[PDB]
Structures are given as C-alpha cells and as structure tokens.
Swiss-Prot record, chains A, C, D, E:
SMART domains: Cpn10. Together with the chaperonin GroEL, plays an essential role in assisting protein folding. The GroEL-GroES system forms a nano-cage that allows encapsulation of the non-native substrate proteins and provides a physical environment optimized to promote and accelerate protein folding, probably by preventing aggregation and by entropically destabilizing folding intermediates. GroES binds to the apical surface of the GroEL ring, thereby capping the opening of the GroEL channel. Regulates the ATPase activity of GroEL. (Microbial infection) Essential for the assembly of several bacteriophages. GO terms for biological process: chaperone cofactor-dependent protein refolding; protein folding; response to heat; virion assembly. CDD domains: cpn10. The gene is groES. The keyword Magnesium does not apply. It is found in: Cytoplasm. This is Co-chaperonin GroES. One of its GO terms (cellular component) is GroEL-GroES complex.
UniProtKB/Swiss-Prot annotation, chain B:
GO terms for cellular component: cytosol; GroEL-GroES complex; membrane. It comes from Escherichia coli (strain K12). The modification N6-succinyllysine is found at K2, K46, K115. The gene is groEL. One of its GO terms (molecular function) is unfolded protein binding. Forms a cylinder of 14 subunits composed of two heptameric rings stacked back-to-back. Interacts with the co-chaperonin GroES. Can form asymmetrical complexes, composed of one GroEL and one GroES, and symmetrical complexes, formed between one GroEL and two GroES oligomers. The asymmetrical complex is the functional unit. It was suggested that the symmetric heterooligomer may represent a transient intermediate in the chaperonin protein folding cycle. GO terms for biological process: chaperone cofactor-dependent protein refolding; protein folding; protein refolding; response to heat; response to radiation; virion assembly. Belongs to the chaperonin (HSP60) family. This is Chaperonin GroEL. The chain holds residues 276 to 412 of 548 of the full protein. It comes from the Bacteria. Its main location: cytoplasm.
C-alpha cells in the first residue's frame, strides 16, 4: 500500500463520459478530463503552527471534486494512474 | 455541405433556401444563437442528394406565396440592374426558385468544329429568346 | 446533494437580464454575465490558526454579489451549471 | 437594502467638478474622476486570527478619500452605480 | 480638517531649493524633488494582531524624510497638494 504525508490525498480520476445528455458520442477536445475522482489514501493531517495535528474532513471511499493545477501531480503506481495532491485543492464532496 | 456564394450572394442563397424549405437562417446580426435553435427554425424537405460536386434539394416544403413574393422581389431587383453579370446571376436565382436550369452539351469530333457549332447554338438560343420576346416577321 | 469544504460556497448564477431601463433589448457583449447568485451549499467554516472553526456569515437561500475571478470555478452538477468558489470572494448580501 | 461582509464599505463617489478655481470649464481627460465618496453601508468588521471581530473606524455618514485599485469594484444597485471596496483602501476621513 | 486612518501620515512636501552650495541656480531635471516634508495629521495607530493599537512614534510638527514609492499618494486639499502615505515610508526625523 501507499500512504501520503500530512494533508495529501490519493485519488483516482473517473473515466470521461463519451455520451452527454443523450446518445451523441463526444470525441475530441470537447470531452475534457473529468474533475471527479475516488479517494484511496488519506494522510494523518495538516500540522498546525503550535504543533498538534488535525484530521482531514474527507474520508476514504467518498467521491470528491478537485481542481487540476500545478499542485496536482500524476504518479504511476502498480500499473495504474493515480493523483497525488493536497487536501486544500479539494472543492466539494458528492453525496 | 458548404453554403454557396461569397459575400452578400451567400446571404441571398441561404435566404432563398430558407424560403423554399420553410426554415429560418440562424445568424448573429439578426439576433439568434445556434444554441437557441429549435425544430421550428429547421427547414423540411422530401429528398436531398449530395455527391462529390453537387447538392440538390427535391420537393421543398414551402407555401407558394413565399416563393411568389421572393421572386417578385428578385424581379424588382432585376429591373434596376446595370451589369449583365448581375442580371444573369439574378435570372439564375429566379430559375432556381421558380423554374429550372437546362444545359445543352454540344458534340463534335474536333475543337474547331466544337467551337463553331457552339457559336451557332448560342446564336440560335439568342434568336429564339428574341423571337419569343417580340415576335417574328 | 453536494456539500463544500471549509469556506467554500456553491451558488447558482442569475439569468442575464435582456431589458434594461425600458423595452430596449440588449444582445451581444453589452449584456455581461450577472454578478448575482443564490446560495445553495455552505461549508462548515474556515479553520483558524489555533484549530477551532467558525461558521460562515452567509446562509443558504440568500442572494449575494460575488467577484468572478481565477478562484471562481464552474462545475456541471445535476445537468446544471454551478459555481464552487471561496467565501472571500463574496462582496455583499442583498436584503 | 444591501449590507457588506467583513471589512467592505459601500460608497457613492461624488460628481466630478467642472469649475476649478474659478469659472474655467474643465472638459476631457484633464478632469479626473473624483476620489471622494459618501459611505452608505459598513460591514461588521475584520476577523482577527484568534477569532473575535473588531468594528470599523469609519461610520456611515462621513466623507472619505479612497485610493482606486484592482480591489475596488463598481456595481449597479437601485439603478445607481456604487463602489464595493475594502476598508484598507480608505485613506482619510474629511471632517 | 482631515484625519488619517491606522498608520497613515499627512505631510506637506517642502519646496525644492534653487541654489545648491552657492549662488548657482539649478533648473531642469538636476533639481530632484524634495524628500523632506512637514507632518500635518497623524492617525490613531497601527492595529496589532491581538487587537490593541499602538500610537505612532512621529508627532505632528516634526520634519521627516520619506522615500517616494507606489504607496505614496498625492491629494489636493484646501487648494494645496498634500501627500497621504503610510508610516512605514518614513525613514528618519530631523532634529
């Protein structure tokens, strides 16, 4: 297994849908990378200035919406694309 | 398929197609967007055939009053034309909207015979048009 | 449902008005995107330096004026455009 | 009625004077936009790091001099242009 | 009367000298703008993180040397140019 450090979370990007709002197949630059993923590993928590650690609000098994950016990094583990990225980049939790 | 015509003549061709098929042209300068288009803005027809070079529309669905009004406007524009090229193009538009287009292909073994027979056929065509227009003696 | 994290607020942008001070219809770049929206989802609150959390001042159901920028993100949820954006970009609350 | 959030202040800039030091009429780019406005609404106050809120030093009713910038934003309320801008951009209070 | 806010100081820029180290008259770009001014109004003081306020070290009536920069603003009051600028730009106090 792989566990992150501090406030970083392992997520796996969902497959991009080929059909949107009907049976029309979307191919090309219109089908952008999905902004939804499945969390896999969660670190211990962010380190505060005084010294204690606070646990993350997200839990393993939830679906989250994240922003692709400079902080988000892609890493090849066990022949599978995963994302290493900080918790502060997570926007919202679905359901 | 691509819209025929370059410039304002493309507008004329598109508007004529819309009148013939009973549709509405979607453009920026009139005030509609393509995302706002619905079923009513789309024209209707019976048969459409496309090949490597030509596109034809068969049995357009449109009320004859619109075609009559459009050809009346085109005739009025013809009556105020100076150049022969312009009157020829507008007459072609009238033929497309109202009548038809007929092409006569001349046959000959060589090129000089081709050219002379073509010239004679053109002269006969012009003479027939004039005789229809004004009568014979 | 979708819930935000920390100090993020989910809003629905108001429709752009077509008539301004009369019956004159505005079409094109004259009518800019509306800077008003209805609050839909509110997170738990911002995390302070000490560790405690304070609830947001804005409430769900009110209409707010927000400054669109780089921090404002547009997402497609329930086949509808929504804005996931930080509380610091909320400027004022109408009524 | 519109109320701001945190340390934002609602102001209405004064009309640009046409006569400067006499009857000479100033028209064009010479007459710069007024940097003086009348405060309309004042928020609760800035949020300190520890957590308590401190009220603003500017009260509604006075005339203030503000420095325009990127943070100063102009919005149309009650068919009247008003400026939403932070308290830190207030320079001084007249009288 | 005009009073500043927080740690801003009202100064009056002194006239640039025409004669330097003798009777030679300096005209043009050689005569740099004076960096000395007379303080007019002093605000209550800079706000601290805890919440307390500390009075400024500079007092009204002294002569100070300041550096011109982006934070220094020139305003017209009482038909007279004055400078509204933060206390951090004061370098030294003459006498």
């Amino acid at each position: 297994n792989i566990r992150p450090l501090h406030d970083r979370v392992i997520v796996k990007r969902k497959e991009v849908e080929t059909k949107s709002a009907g049976g029309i197949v979307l191919t090309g630059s219109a089908a952008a990378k999905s902004t939804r993923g499945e969390v896999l590993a969660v670190g211990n928590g962010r380190i505060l200035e005084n010294g204690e650690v606070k646990p993350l609000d997200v839990k393993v098994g939830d679906i989250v919406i994240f922003n692709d950016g400079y902080g988000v990094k892609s890493e090849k583990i066990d022949n599978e694309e995963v994302l290493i990225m900080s918790e502060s980049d997570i926007l919202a939790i679905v359901e | 398929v691509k819209a025929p015509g370059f410039g304002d003549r493309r507008k004329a061709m598109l508007q004529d197609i819309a009148t013939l098929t009973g549709g509405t042209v979607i453009s920026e300068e009139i005030g509609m967007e393509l995302e706002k288009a619905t079923l009513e803005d789309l024209g209707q027809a019976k048969r459409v055939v496309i090949n490597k070079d030509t596109t034809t529309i068969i049995d357009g669905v449109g009320e004859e009053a619109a075609i009559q009004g459009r050809v009346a406007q085109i005739r009025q524009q013809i009556e105020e034309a100076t150049s022969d090229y312009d009157r020829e193009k507008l007459q072609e538009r009238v033929a497309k909207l109202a009548g038809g287009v007929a092409v006569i292909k001349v046959g000959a073994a060589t090129e000089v015979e081709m050219k002379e027979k073509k010239a004679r056929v053109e002269d006969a065509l012009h003479a027939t048009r004039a005789a229809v227009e004004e009568g014979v003696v």
